Amino acid sequence: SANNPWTGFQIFLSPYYANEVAAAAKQITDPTLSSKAASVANIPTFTWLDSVAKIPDLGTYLASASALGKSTGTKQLVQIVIYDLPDRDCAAKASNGEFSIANNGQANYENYIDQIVAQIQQFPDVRVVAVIEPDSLANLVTNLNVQKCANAKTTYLASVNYALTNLAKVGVYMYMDAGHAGWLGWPANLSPAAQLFTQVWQNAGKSPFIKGLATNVANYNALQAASPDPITQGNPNYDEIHYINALAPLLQQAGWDATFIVDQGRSGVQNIRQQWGDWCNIKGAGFGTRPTTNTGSQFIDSIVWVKPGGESCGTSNSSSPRYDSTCSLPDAAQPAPEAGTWFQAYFQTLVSAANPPL
Ligand SMILES: *[C@@H]1O[C@H](CO)[C@@H](O[C@@H]2O[C@H](CO)[C@@H](O)[C@H](O)[C@H]2NC(C)=O)[C@H](O)[C@H]1NC(C)=O
């Protein structure tokens, strides 16, 4: 559209990912591979606010971005993921979300949003782009027979509403998570998906700050595949461009000229999955297309790196309180540490298998 949130801005680079990557590169013994790894700290990623404990970090990033913009004569942009719904990840075998619907989950989540708004309010010279709640609304399309998801439906809808409505008041550009081509891109899922996302957009007042949708977050799909991944059989929308090309007109018909961002951070290697639903620490993944607004699609504002490659998706240790058995599948890299903690061997392969090369 006319207003691409990224145009004319310099993206603030995550210091947390930068620190993880710096510590990782010096453990990589091959000196040319190590230097390639270190340059990954120069590639913009999204910062995940997956708990209230991450909110002070947001404050420091906004303040640092503000000072960097003044130091360099630029306008800075901070990239965040809103990821703390009560009863988070309702269809998963395990979730790490700190809030529960049974224990004031909605009110606690609204306080989490309020604390994020109170930080953003203080730095109006910094632009913020937020991905809204991966692995949430997409469950309300296809997973309503999971009892945890059926029970969470009204809370997901109310809490996402609260996030959209209140982040809009401080001017945050927002992309609702919308799964990926293998989830909502199935032709039969397109209309129910469009209906849900449009209703959410309406409930939040159709704010122009609700730009559209984020796809392939933390996943591995191609944006544009040379040949369909065997896991996609039965779905004519076998990559993200097919999915977005099919969904975007349905949103436009409802009055919402929605645009998209697409995670490609771990999309460099295709055809590495046994089944499309396999999502955890998929073995052999490589860093993919670097973030850019040169997307080739009228519908896509940016290719992005939302999931930071090298942070684990989940432990493969079946004795952990947080164990998700998806993370022990044959196509899952093992042994894997706890979700969010650094997974050095996985990072090294992301670097070695990067396509385009680093
Ligand atoms: C796999 O998970 C279990 C439990 O989460 C870990 O075993 C516990 O580890 C803690 C800290 O080392 C100890 O206090 C407990 O006594 C252990 N309980 C049992 C039954 O062993 C286990 O260490 C984890 N394995 C790995 C590689 O992380």
Overview of this protein structure:
It is a single chain. The chain has helices at 15-25, 31-39, 55-72, 105-120, 139-142, 147-169, 187-203, 240-253, 344-352; strands spanning 10-11, 47-49, 76-82, 127-132, 173-177, 210-215, 259-263, 300-304. The protein has 358 residues and is α/β, with parallel strands linked by helices. Helix 1 (15-25) packs antiparallel against helix 2. The protein is globular and about 55 Å long. The relative contact order is 0.13. A molecule of 2 linked components (NAG-NAG) binds at residues 317, 319-321. The PDB classes it as hydrolase. Keywords: Glycoside hydrolase family 6, cellobiohydrolase, cellulase, catalytic domain, mutant, hydrolase. It forms a monomeric assembly.
In short:
The chain has 358 residues and is of the alpha/beta class.
Question: What ligands can be seen in this structure?
Answer: a molecule of 2 linked components (NAG-NAG)
Q: Superfamily at the CATH H level?
A: 1, 4-beta cellobiohydrolase
Domain count: the total is: 1
Could you say what the CATH topology is called? TIM Barrel
Assign the CATH architecture.
Alpha-Beta Barrel
- The secondary-structure element order is EHHEHEHEHHEHEHEEH
Shape: globular
Keywords: Carbohydrate metabolism, Cellulose degradation, Disulfide bond, Glycosidase, Hydrolase, Polysaccharide degradation, Signal
Active site: 89, 135 (proton donor), 313 (proton acceptor)
Binding site for substrate: 48, 50, 180, 183, 219, 279, 307, 311
EC number: 3.2.1.-
